[PDB]
Design a protein around this nucleic acid. Structure first.
Lengths: 90, 70, 108, 106
RNA sequence: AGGGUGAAAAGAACCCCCAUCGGGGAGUGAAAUAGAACAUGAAACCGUAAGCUCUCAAGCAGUGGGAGGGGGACCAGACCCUGACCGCGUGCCUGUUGAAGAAUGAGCCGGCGACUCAUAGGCAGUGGCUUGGUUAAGGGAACCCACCGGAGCCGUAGCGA
RNA sequence: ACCCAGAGCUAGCUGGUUCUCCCCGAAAUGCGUUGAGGCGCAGCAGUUGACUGGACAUCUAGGGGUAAAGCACUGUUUCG
RNA sequence: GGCCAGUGAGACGAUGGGGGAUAAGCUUCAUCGUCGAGAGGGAAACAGCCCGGAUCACCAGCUAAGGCCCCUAAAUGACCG
RNA sequence: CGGUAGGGGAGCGUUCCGUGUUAGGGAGAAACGCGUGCGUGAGCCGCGUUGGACGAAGCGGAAGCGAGAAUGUCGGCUUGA
RNA sequence: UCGGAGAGAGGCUCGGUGAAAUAGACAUGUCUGUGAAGAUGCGGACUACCUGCACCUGGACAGAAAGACCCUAUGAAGCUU
RNA sequence: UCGCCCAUUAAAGCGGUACGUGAGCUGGGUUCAGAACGUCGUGAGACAGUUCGGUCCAUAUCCGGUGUGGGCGUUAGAGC
């Protein structure tokens, strides 16, 4: 149990009177910050790069079928006449 | 309430098996005739996002399973 | 008293393109390492050394770079591998990296 | 004593720096006696007279009254208050052992 | 906006000042240094009394040195109050490249008066399990809570649109 | 117009943000920006892991066209 | 490389220059000092110059920069101009 | 071991809860005002007066938890006189 | 020009009642110097018993209204095509 | 303001003091709203272009000044 930062209660406790936000400006003010990923009016990365071939209008991503096991992974779970190694036993 | 994913960005950043963010290169949609055979091959392929901009990308979509190498 | 200031017709440039000698004389190189970005052939291509479309001069082989004298008032660039490169644990660098390593190991 | 001079006469006490290693009641001899005096006083050529050694007794090793050290700078929210009680020692002088050397005084 | 005499009105018979108000004795009561403006009663602000002390001074008012005087029914080179005269010493905050500033803010004193909570995501510290881990709603002589509920979730295979 | 409600509207703007000690300790730059007193990323703080050897000092080797100097080139210039 | 900040108005001085009138406590770059965020001593007072980097105590001592008639620590010191 | 923005570590108090219908308390608690104790500090600790019934530690927990600045705000009281 | 005299209502004194804006703290001199470049507060000088009342407004960048000019805000609102 | 001119005169000096002085005065000029002329503007409106009309606060705390008292001081106290 750490005991957190009740913030702005004397300059000895440290993070006091402005509370570790420096000096005015957008990040100082109360309320929401900005958009997250916002590059300041410069074109954001997330909107100046093309979008990943298949995911650009249709084409559902290759969601996996088959529930792959391996022969390496079976050997650890041992049974002599391994009676139907299937969806049931595993 | 429970974080919405930034599905504008998500569609430009995929994550690979080992856990690195990957993007497509910019440039090669049109005005292709005037570029070389050479540079279109470098613009075809995927690379990592630069270590600088990981912060914004991870911050945008928080259900990635992305490993900053630790 | 308050007269008008005449505009200029100047104020254009291009940010320095970063040409010049990337790999210096008597220095390590690689197969493929760019030695010089020069705008024309200030230096000329020597042996063991490619010369590109932009008069870019790059090394083909390992070895140290050499700026030879061409004949009548010009410069060449060739590359030569080096035979044997000896290291002695006598010296100060060797002493100190082993001392450091041993301290590292001693602590943990 | 603690790189610090004192006129010292017998049957009489002094305050000094806390003597490291000294007990509560424990007599000691001070061997740095730069001067002695009487009817016929006696200076020193070098330092210490020669074989003169003042004879004293430790009393107690209590701390000094609190001195308040206070760092302050104007307008920077830099008030820093800190006390300090220097440890001292009380010693009581029993006698001066006689000089037997270099008699001055005309 | 404006609560709290006392356990009990026992709320002051009588006397004095006196037209009233109010006051002092008396009386009641554990208490009236609880008297109705009544319980604890801080500060600013207003006085009264005692110790020292300013009318040739100049000063952000203190500070280091300390003349002369005074103590506390408790015998100290200890301690406290005053303070002749000397040296030093450009109120605080905000906010600036830079503020004693003649930049901003506060008449003073007391209260109230500001990074919180809910839910998620990342990271660290700690703990439990590691036969992988964990249950959600929901059920519980309610709420917590034994004890159930494995539905789901996370990890166990990537590559490619 | 007023009154009540949306409504604690929003305010990249100004003011304000309360106990103590110890350790480290910046920046006021580049880049982009309907941006210029804002923001992003880099640069420079703290903190915690991993990789190694440098730091300061002296001595060599490299390519430079600057101070200097010069009039063979490019201009400019005086006298015969 | 992980987690998590502030900063993004700078100022003066030395030098190398530009702009200006080789005016400005002017302005803009480049290299370094100090302030900024740094007390103390020298500069009468005096952010930015010189000396020097304040953990704390001492009614000890040696010195840097700078000084030695009095205000006010130290030579009304010396010899030659 | 100077330090603004700023980051990290270590603490003190405030009311309330568990322990606790604890001991301590009308031979005097909370409070209120004074201390020739203590601590690096926030603070702690004993005192007999006023006061008239609540309520320490220690080990733990939780917040309407610390004020001098907001032309803050409510109340009191000055100054000008 | 160029003022002068006089009457009322104040002003002044005594008794009665009794406000105000303002106000970090105020033991609140002049000169020149210094400094955020215009000092009762910093340096050097000069001048100056302590304290009322009447008159006067040069200063306290006096009081009054978070400049109404100027510019800024990817502020508000009217009006135009 | 400056300036020109009339009548003079010994002469009709030039400057600093927030281009001295608005908590001393004035409000003619210039920085609000009305209205007009010329002009610019498709228009609303505009123009150190012009014209007419248009609210100037204050009980002196301190320093500072002009006056005028009181206290105390001047070493025993007084009047000249």
């Amino acid at each position: 149990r750490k005991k957190g930062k009740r913030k702005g209660r004397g300059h000895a406790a440290g993070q006091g009177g402005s509370c570790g936000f420096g000096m005015r400006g957008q990040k100082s003010r109360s309320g929401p910050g900005i958009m997250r990923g916002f590059e300041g009016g410069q074109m954001p990365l997330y909107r100046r790069i093309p979008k990943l071939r298949g995911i650009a209008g249709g084409m559902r991503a290759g969601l996996p079928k088959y529930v792959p096991i391996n022969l390496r992974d079976i050997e650890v779970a041992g049974f002599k006449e391994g009676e139907e190694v299937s969806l049931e036993s595993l | 309430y429970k974080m919405k994913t930034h599905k504008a960005s998500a569609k430009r950043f995929r994550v690979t098996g080992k856990g690195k963010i990957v993007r497509r290169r910019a440039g090669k949609q049109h005005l292709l005739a005037k570029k070389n055979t050479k540079r279109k091959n470098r613009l075809s392929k995927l690379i990592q996002v630069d270590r600088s901009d990981y912060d914004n990308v991870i911050g945008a979509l928080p259900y990635l399973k992305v490993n900053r190498k630790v | 008293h308050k007269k008008g200031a005449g505009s200029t017709k100047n104020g254009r440039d291009s940010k320095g393109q970063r040409l010049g000698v990337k790999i210096y004389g008597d220095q390590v190189a690689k197969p493929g390492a760019i030695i010089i970005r020069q705008r024309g052939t200030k230096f000329h291509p020597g042996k063991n050394v490619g010369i590109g479309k932009d008069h870019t001069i790059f090394a083909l082989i390992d070895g140290l770079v050499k700026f030879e004298k061409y004949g009548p008032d010009k410069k060449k660039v060739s590359v030569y591998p080096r035979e044997i490169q000896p290291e002695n644990p006598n010296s100060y660098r060797a002493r100190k990296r082993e001392n450091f390593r041993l301290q590292r190991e001693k602590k943990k | 004593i603690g790189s610090r001079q004192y006129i010292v006469i017998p049957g009489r006490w002094i305050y000094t720096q806390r003597l490291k290693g000294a007990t509560v009641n424990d007599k000691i001899v001070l061997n740095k006696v730069l001067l002695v005096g009487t009817k016929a006083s006696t200076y020193i050529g070098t330092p210490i007279v020669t074989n003169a050694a003042v004879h004293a007794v430790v009393e107690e090793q209590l701390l000094d009254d609190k001195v308040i050290v206070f760092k302050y700078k104007k307008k920077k929210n830099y008030r820093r208050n800190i006390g300090h009680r220097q440890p001292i020692t009380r010693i009581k002088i029993t006698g001066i052992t006689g000089y037997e050397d270099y008699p001055a005084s005309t």
